[PDB]
Enzyme design. Sequence first.
Site, PDB file in Angstrom:
ATOM      1  N   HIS A   1       0.231  -1.244  -0.119  1.00 18.44           N
ATOM      2  CA  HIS A   1      -0.371  -0.204   0.299  1.00 18.44           C
ATOM      3  C   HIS A   1       0.887   1.271   0.103  1.00 18.44           C
ATOM      4  O   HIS A   1       1.717   1.094   0.830  1.00 18.44           O
ATOM      5  CB  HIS A   1      -0.992   0.108   1.138  1.00 18.44           C
ATOM      6  CG  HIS A   1      -1.676   1.689   1.172  1.00 18.44           C
ATOM      7  ND1 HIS A   1      -2.630   1.451   0.437  1.00 18.44           N
ATOM      8  CD2 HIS A   1      -1.841   2.326   2.683  1.00 18.44           C
ATOM      9  CE1 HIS A   1      -3.180   2.333   1.244  1.00 18.44           C
ATOM     10  NE2 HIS A   1      -2.612   2.814   2.657  1.00 18.44           N
TER      11      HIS A   1
HETATM   12  C1  LIG Z   1       6.144   8.871   7.234  1.00 16.18           C
HETATM   13  C2  LIG Z   1       5.558   8.006   6.839  1.00 16.18           C
HETATM   14  C3  LIG Z   1       5.027   6.523   5.651  1.00 16.18           C
HETATM   15  C4  LIG Z   1       4.473   5.919   5.385  1.00 16.18           C
HETATM   16  N1  LIG Z   1       4.138   5.283   4.538  1.00 16.18           N
HETATM   17  C5  LIG Z   1       3.680   3.778   4.708  1.00 16.18           C
HETATM   18  C6  LIG Z   1       3.503   3.189   3.191  1.00 16.18           C
HETATM   19  O1  LIG Z   1       3.784   3.846   2.055  1.00 16.18           O
HETATM   20  N2  LIG Z   1       3.074   1.997   3.204  1.00 16.18           N
HETATM   21  C7  LIG Z   1       2.480   1.121   4.537  1.00 16.18           C
HETATM   22  O2  LIG Z   1       2.474   0.320   4.409  1.00 16.18           O
HETATM   23  N3  LIG Z   1       2.938   2.129   5.503  1.00 16.18           N
HETATM   24  C8  LIG Z   1       3.296   2.937   5.558  1.00 16.18           C
HETATM   25  N4  LIG Z   1       3.356   4.133   7.241  1.00 16.18           N
HETATM   26  C9  LIG Z   1       3.373   2.750   8.518  1.00 16.18           C
HETATM   27  C10 LIG Z   1       1.656   2.857   8.320  1.00 16.18           C
HETATM   28  O3  LIG Z   1       1.294   4.814   8.707  1.00 16.18           O
HETATM   29  C11 LIG Z   1       1.251   2.491   9.685  1.00 16.18           C
HETATM   30  O4  LIG Z   1       2.028   1.092   9.894  1.00 16.18           O
HETATM   31  C12 LIG Z   1       0.136   2.460  10.035  1.00 16.18           C
HETATM   32  O5  LIG Z   1      -0.797   3.408   9.779  1.00 16.18           O
HETATM   33  C13 LIG Z   1      -0.114   1.707  11.292  1.00 16.18           C
HETATM   34  O6  LIG Z   1      -1.448   2.279  12.012  1.00 16.18           O
HETATM   35  P1  LIG Z   1      -2.086   1.448  13.481  1.00 16.18           P
HETATM   36  O7  LIG Z   1      -3.089   0.797  13.002  1.00 16.18           O
HETATM   37  O8  LIG Z   1      -0.602   0.584  14.044  1.00 16.18           O
HETATM   38  O9  LIG Z   1      -2.026   2.916  14.106  1.00 16.18           O
HETATM   39  P2  LIG Z   1      -2.142   4.294  13.462  1.00 16.18           P
HETATM   40  O10 LIG Z   1      -2.260   4.209  11.951  1.00 16.18           O
HETATM   41  O11 LIG Z   1      -1.252   5.721  13.321  1.00 16.18           O
HETATM   42  O12 LIG Z   1      -3.819   4.242  14.423  1.00 16.18           O
HETATM   43  C14 LIG Z   1      -3.476   5.529  15.670  1.00 16.18           C
HETATM   44  C15 LIG Z   1      -3.753   6.363  15.776  1.00 16.18           C
HETATM   45  O13 LIG Z   1      -3.927   6.510  17.552  1.00 16.18           O
HETATM   46  C16 LIG Z   1      -4.613   7.861  17.930  1.00 16.18           C
HETATM   47  N5  LIG Z   1      -4.052   7.638  19.485  1.00 16.18           N
HETATM   48  C17 LIG Z   1      -3.071   7.977  19.622  1.00 16.18           C
HETATM   49  N6  LIG Z   1      -2.811   8.097  21.036  1.00 16.18           N
HETATM   50  C18 LIG Z   1      -4.425   7.839  21.412  1.00 16.18           C
HETATM   51  C19 LIG Z   1      -4.716   7.815  22.541  1.00 16.18           C
HETATM   52  N7  LIG Z   1      -4.363   7.184  23.646  1.00 16.18           N
HETATM   53  N8  LIG Z   1      -6.094   8.663  22.473  1.00 16.18           N
HETATM   54  C20 LIG Z   1      -6.577   7.960  21.560  1.00 16.18           C
HETATM   55  N9  LIG Z   1      -6.235   8.020  20.300  1.00 16.18           N
HETATM   56  C21 LIG Z   1      -5.012   8.149  20.044  1.00 16.18           C
HETATM   57  C22 LIG Z   1      -3.468   8.895  16.530  1.00 16.18           C
HETATM   58  O14 LIG Z   1      -4.036   9.473  16.861  1.00 16.18           O
HETATM   59  C23 LIG Z   1      -3.521   7.802  15.249  1.00 16.18           C
HETATM   60  O15 LIG Z   1      -4.609   8.042  14.259  1.00 16.18           O
HETATM   61  C24 LIG Z   1       3.892   5.271   7.292  1.00 16.18           C
HETATM   62  C25 LIG Z   1       4.881   5.526   8.092  1.00 16.18           C
HETATM   63  C26 LIG Z   1       4.731   7.360   8.205  1.00 16.18           C
HETATM   64  C27 LIG Z   1       5.335   8.047   9.340  1.00 16.18           C
END
Ligand SMILES: Cc1cc2nc3c(=O)[nH]c(=O)nc-3n(C[C@H](O)[C@H](O)[C@H](O)COP(=O)(O)OP(=O)(O)OC[C@H]3O[C@@H](n4cnc5c(N)ncnc54)[C@H](O)[C@@H]3O)c2cc1C
Lengths: 489, 487
Positions: free
Chosen positions: A463
């Site tokens: 993705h």
């Molecule tokens: C610059 C960058 C580029 C990326 N590019 C890619 C890519 O091209 N392809 C890919 O596969 N992955 C990419 N990633 C990785 C991807 O974004 C993450 O692996 C993915 O978003 C993980 O999802 P998650 O469910 O772990 O958490 P996230 O999607 O980060 O969501 C966690 C959420 O929890 C919220 N939150 C945090 N603490 C609290 C709190 N205590 N209370 C309420 N809410 C809270 C945050 O605001 C956030 O919105 C990239 C990351 C970055 C930084």
Amino acid sequence: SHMSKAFDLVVIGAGSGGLEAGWNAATLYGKRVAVVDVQTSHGPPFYAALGGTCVNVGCVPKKLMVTGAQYMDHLRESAGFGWEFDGSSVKANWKKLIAAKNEAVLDINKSYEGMFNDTEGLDFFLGWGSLESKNVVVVRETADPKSAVKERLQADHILLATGSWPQMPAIPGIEHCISSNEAFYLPEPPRRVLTVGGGFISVEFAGIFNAYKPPGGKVTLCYRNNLILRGFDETIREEVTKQLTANGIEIMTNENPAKVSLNTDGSKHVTFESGKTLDVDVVMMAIGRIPRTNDLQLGNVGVKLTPKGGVQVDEFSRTNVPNIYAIGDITDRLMLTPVAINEGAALVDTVFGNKPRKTDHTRVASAVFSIPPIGTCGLIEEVAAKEFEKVAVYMSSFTPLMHNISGSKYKKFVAKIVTNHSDGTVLGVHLLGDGAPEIIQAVGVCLRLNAKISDFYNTIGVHPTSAEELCSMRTPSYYYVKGEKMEKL
Amino acid sequence: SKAFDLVVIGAGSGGLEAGWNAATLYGKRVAVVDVQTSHGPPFYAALGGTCVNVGCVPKKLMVTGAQYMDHLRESAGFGWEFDGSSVKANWKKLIAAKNEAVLDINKSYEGMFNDTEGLDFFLGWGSLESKNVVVVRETADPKSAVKERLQADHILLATGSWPQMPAIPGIEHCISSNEAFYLPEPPRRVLTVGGGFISVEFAGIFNAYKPPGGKVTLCYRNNLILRGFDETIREEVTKQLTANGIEIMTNENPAKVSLNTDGSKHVTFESGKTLDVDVVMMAIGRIPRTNDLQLGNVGVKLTPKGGVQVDEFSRTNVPNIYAIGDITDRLMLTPVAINEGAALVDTVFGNKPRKTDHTRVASAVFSIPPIGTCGLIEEVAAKEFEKVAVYMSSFTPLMHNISGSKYKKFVAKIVTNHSDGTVLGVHLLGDGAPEIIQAVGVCLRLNAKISDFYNTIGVHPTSAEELCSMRTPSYYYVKGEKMEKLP
Ligand SMILES: Cc1cc2nc3c(=O)[nH]c(=O)nc-3n(C[C@H](O)[C@H](O)[C@H](O)COP(=O)(O)OP(=O)(O)OC[C@H]3O[C@@H](n4cnc5c(N)ncnc54)[C@H](O)[C@@H]3O)c2cc1C
Ligand SMILES: Cc1cc2nc3c(=O)[nH]c(=O)nc-3n(C[C@H](O)[C@H](O)[C@H](O)COP(=O)(O)OP(=O)(O)OC[C@H]3O[C@@H](n4cnc5c(N)ncnc54)[C@H](O)[C@@H]3O)c2cc1C
Ligand SMILES: CC1=Nc2ccc(Cl)cc2[C@H](c2ccccc2)N1CCN1CCN(C(=O)c2ccco2)CC1
Ligand SMILES: CC1=Nc2ccc(Cl)cc2[C@H](c2ccccc2)N1CCN1CCN(C(=O)c2ccco2)CC1
Ligand SMILES: [Cl-]
Ligand SMILES: [Cl-]
Ligand SMILES: [Cl-]
Ligand SMILES: [Cl-]
Ligand SMILES: [Cl-]
Ligand SMILES: [Cl-]
Ligand code: NA
Ligand code: NA
Ligand code: NA
Ligand code: NA
């Protein structure tokens, strides 16, 4: 000296199939091989040459020229991402394109020539080959069997691999028209052009001409039936029609040229069967390709032709004469370079290795370099639906986000997976959009491993990409049940 | 106050998938907590997660935008003529178009909550009050005012990850990727710090949009960027970055940063070298975001590096408390978090336990030109199999002999267990590579051998067919040892 030369294998036509056969036989198996072609490098008078249709006037130069054509979309689409430059300065220099293509092609010609000069047991003969007897190929100065003899080549085994040629219709003023062959060498890009045909060449050229046209230019494609690109997925057929129209191409379906005459200014005046008219600077016919069997003097040895005109072969590429084989477009089946090549390799394994092997003509991936391109592998749904009691179609279509910023909102990516719903087996996958020819390749490996829809669904997506769409579908959009289409079972 | 089957902390990639699947597939009652509804300062991530707001989605648009610097140059090779002196890269337009697309997704996601039964969004900061209660407060401070108490049968930790910022003096004059998404002006001189994909991707972005006289430097503490990816590819991408004007400083690490009177930054490296730049973007790592959760209230165990410990079913040590996505500090990819979310929901609320497979996950680096990869690199394969073959193809495609970008070598590598032909990994560098590699992901789920690749008929002309034209290894690893001939 003035004596004939002898070989294990003589191959007539140094193209996709023949070169694979001959290189394999000489280098893998130590056979003595001769290969005949009419020209050592690309272009007029005979167009195809050492390296075949694909290298000279086929896949290789057309892909270059489509890549050139794509810059018109790129230069315009850049503005949505912040790129600013003087748009009024832009010109498409066709002559530079053509000169760059010609030198690329000529470099392959010289490369191939060099390999013949160098490789033991693998010899190139210039001229026109035909069958004098089942063990002698004669190489003449022209395609006339009365022209002078340059060589006689004795052969234990003889491979026919002369390919195909553009079919021109018998209409008045046909002499005012050209094929794809001449299109590659036009001194200048036509202001107005008609491309006659709904197949991949017409469509591909329509997009090349549409990007390099001078100021008040216009590209028209006509097709005698109602929807272009017969044989491809129907959704994709309709969508690519819209997208070509969106980029300024006029598609005329249910239209066929009846005659062409020269206007007093020398432009071409085309009358269609319906009595519509169109004036153009170039009429390019691309209504089909036919096997090249006329100049081989096959009657001298009794090699049979199909009702349709191809050399008849069995699954082992064997003609009715035991040591004479045919591969490639001369068999008039799938006219694709890697099919010709697979058939060549497999022939030589079978005959000279101890390794019988037939080409698989099913689940062959192919592409159309339309703008955007098609990638496809396996059965379209209406064919699948006549062979299998239950078919499911998974479909995802959407303007990708890049193209909602680029301005080319009409560029809808389409991904469809066709299955035998009885067991999940993927029967076909059909793609329209940027990257589709690249996405489809490893899909060909999936199909050869009998992939099921769940094998695709269980794979984690890369993705953000277009390809991840194939790994996100688990519920059919619709079905066919004993041939009838319905949103549900 | 309020009762839920599932409370999800973090409306991100994993958390949304899980929340959606619980509400709509299993008809459960779901609450989802996030800190912000729309992307951008001050908390950066928001509804949609990191991917949507400050990650995959906007970074891809911006790399797409950067690609035109190449396309504009390369058009000349194919005949295209125009006044190159007139060309300028409008960073602000790019930023606005990006902001608009991201905002549309934030709104769309809100609409979805609004219209979906059993799926509720709460704005604020969630933490664990007790084994079955999620407190939602006003700020990250666990002493700030209570907005909600959500009782929960099952609690999902999915707060994702955050940029690691090393404790060097003047670290506060540096930015991360979060801030890079919102810079007012394209930086003229920029240092990106770090060898991983985010550093490299931003280096290519800034390189295309820099003003005249600009210059991007990338620095990395060890000797070769992109650890974990294929070595040939790491070396080649370094060459190709350098060809396009990016300076790669390996074996260098910032020791301090100071503010210059013009508002630029003075960087001092551990080696004593120094560099003045306008922006220093730290992208040395991302760490699990576990700090505001108050995991000590219930004693959920962290691993040594700080992720939430999980078993293969995403279960923490405390019953009915689960963690998925970056917070578990494993693979930090969006589709991996989605898949975890889905598998967790099917296990807890469905008839069938399902665990995510973390092997053979296809991924990309949107460097220019990009990488696609799936499965093992050869050094990893060679410690786990006695006999490893590597098949390699590397050449400048013809199109780039004409474009004039002669440095753009396409690289295709296939790594096998030579004892039985099993493809263990495939590694691509070149235009189209992330697209090419997806269906290779499926191949590896089908016991594909090298001969299955090789016996498949190519699509011509493409870069991909290269993967179906190798049948002779270029070299081997036998018992861990690289050699070019087998014993
Ligand atoms: C610059 C960058 C580029 C990326 N590019 C890619 C890519 O091209 N392809 C890919 O596969 N992955 C990419 N990633 C990785 C991807 O974004 C993450 O692996 C993915 O978003 C993980 O999802 P998650 O469910 O772990 O958490 P996230 O999607 O980060 O969501 C966690 C959420 O929890 C919220 N939150 C945090 N603490 C609290 C709190 N205590 N209370 C309420 N809410 C809270 C945050 O605001 C956030 O919105 C990239 C990351 C970055 C930084
Ligand atoms: C415009 C165009 C674009 C194409 N694009 C694609 C594409 O993108 N991808 C793809 O897979 N396929 C493409 N094709 C089709 C592909 O070119 C053919 O399928 C393939 O070249 C056939 O291989 P072959 O061995 O049958 O013959 P060829 O490669 O056609 O070789 C036949 C050779 O025989 C020589 N010859 C003919 N008669 C004699 C004689 N009597 N004596 C000696 N030599 C003789 C010819 O000069 C020629 O070199 C394209 C075709 C065209 C026309
Ligand atoms: C195998 C092969 N198949 C073809 C299929 C279609 C075409 Cl159009 C061209 C070829 C090409 C070929 C070119 C010239 C004569 C025969 C074959 N060709 C040979 C390409 N060749 C690859 C290997 N090569 C080697 O020197 C080599 C052999 C083993 C290890 O390296 C030089 C060029
Ligand atoms: C399934 C799902 N997973 C997500 C994972 C990560 C993110 Cl960041 C977002 C979603 C998204 C979602 C958006 C808002 C709330 C919950 C879930 N979401 C629902 C988006 N969905 C797209 C397709 N859709 C369908 O109904 C559908 C499913 C299958 C065929 O059509 C409507 C909404
Ligand atoms: Cl011109
Ligand atoms: Cl027609
Ligand atoms: Cl029709
Ligand atoms: Cl700007
Ligand atoms: Cl570092
Ligand atoms: Cl290193
Ligand atoms: Na020779
Ligand atoms: Na998937
Ligand atoms: Na709701
Ligand atoms: Na192959």
